[PDB]
């Protein structure tokens, strides 16, 4: 008990192991059933604790590694009269273990914390209340993106419709696909070198337009 | 009337029960996730115990625990003792605790913003 699973959860998992023990038992050996059952029972319980405990599920072998690191660090802390360094544990672990790998292992074993974690001695505040959303775009982001699309269309209108369409198909403004020179040449009806020529002229015109107007510069981020 | 009994328990969308990585690179998640994990674990174990076949005593206790898990999800602390995280005395926040209460969805986020 106390290893992350409730009492009844442990019992039922031991019941699974008990079932396994019954079906795998051989009475000819004159062994009392309790002897052979206990092994399968402990095995099922330990497997359950290793699997169900952590919110971020970690493979059993990796858990045995982490727990081995726990007994190691605790042995060292018990003999040194202080908490061990990464390098000290790396030594006592044996070959293949350096300070870097130890720190990585510890980083993996880090469990998540509840968002409902109490903030303050009152019940009016929670932990997740102080965490911003990094995913959804702020109004500034959406407005800037719209301004960029508008200013880019204002820039592509300083070109012809053909030499701007070559670029819109090239970088994927229209349809959302970047095309090779062969496809754009298969559409407009000219050679791929003509398309690459048109795209060079268009980009160069946009460079001269940029050098004069000073509009798209602020969007460089 | 038989809709008052659940054959299929719904699952709230992940973003409304989020698992996010904070500033320090650490992880923080909602209690509903631990509650759902309780449900799935006890449910899957029941399906296995039924499949391989088990005495009615074991199946009974597993079923009773399943109801306990369902109750814990919908309304924690309602029936008997509240479900908590290990080492903690703090009861997990259930769907009832989220909707109702002075800190509930209604009073805190709907009637005021």
């Amino acid at each position: 008990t106390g290893r992350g699973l409730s009492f009844l959860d442990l019992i039922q998992e031991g019941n699974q192991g008990l079932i396994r023990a019954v079906e795998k038992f051989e009475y000819k050996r004159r062994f009392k059933f309790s002897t052979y059952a206990t092994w399968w029972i402990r095995q099922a319980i330990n497997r359950a604790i290793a699997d169900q405990a952590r919110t971020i599920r970690i493979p059993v072998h990796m858990v045995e590694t982490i727990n081995k690191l726990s007994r190691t660090a605790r042995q060292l802390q018990q003999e040194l009269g202080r908490e061990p360094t990464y390098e000290e544990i790396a030594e006592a672990m044996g070959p293949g273990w350096d300070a870097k790998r130890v720190e990585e292992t510890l980083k993996i074993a880090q469990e998540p914390v509840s968002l409902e974690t109490p903030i303050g001695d009152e019940k009016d505040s929670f932990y997740g209340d102080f965490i911003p959303d990094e995913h959804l775009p702020s109004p500034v982001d959406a407005a800037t993106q719209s301004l960029l699309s508008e200013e880019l269309e204002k820039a592509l209108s300083k070109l012809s419709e053909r030499e701007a369409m070559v670029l819109k198909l090239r970088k994927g403004l229209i349809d959302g696909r970047e095309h090779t020179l062969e496809e754009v040449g298969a559409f407009f009806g000219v050679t791929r070198e003509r398309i690459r020529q048109i795209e060079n002229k268009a980009l160069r015109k946009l460079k001269y337009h940029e050098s004069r107007t000073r509009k798209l510069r602020d969007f460089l981020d | 009337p038989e809709w008052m009994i659940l054959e299929a328990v719904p699952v709230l969308p992940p973003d409304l029960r989020p698992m996010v990585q904070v500033d320090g690179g650490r992880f923080a998640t909602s209690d509903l996730n631990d509650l759902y994990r309780r449900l799935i674990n006890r449910n899957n174990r029941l399906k296995k115990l039924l499949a391989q076949g088990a005495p009615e005593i074991i199946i009974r206790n597993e079923k009773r625990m399943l109801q306990e898990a369902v109750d814990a999800l919908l309304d924690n602390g309602r029936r008997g003792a509240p479900v908590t995280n290990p080492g903690s005395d703090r009861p997990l926040r259930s769907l009832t605790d989220i909707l109702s209460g002075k800190q509930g969805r209604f009073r805190q986020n709907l009637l005021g913003k």
Binding site: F7, L8 | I57, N61, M65, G80
Partner: peptide
């Protein structure tokens, strides 16, 4: 009432 005690009673019958 108490799930643990109840299961312990169901076990004491056998």
């Amino acid at each position: 009432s108490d799930p643990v005690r109840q299961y312990l009673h169901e076990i004491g019958q056998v």
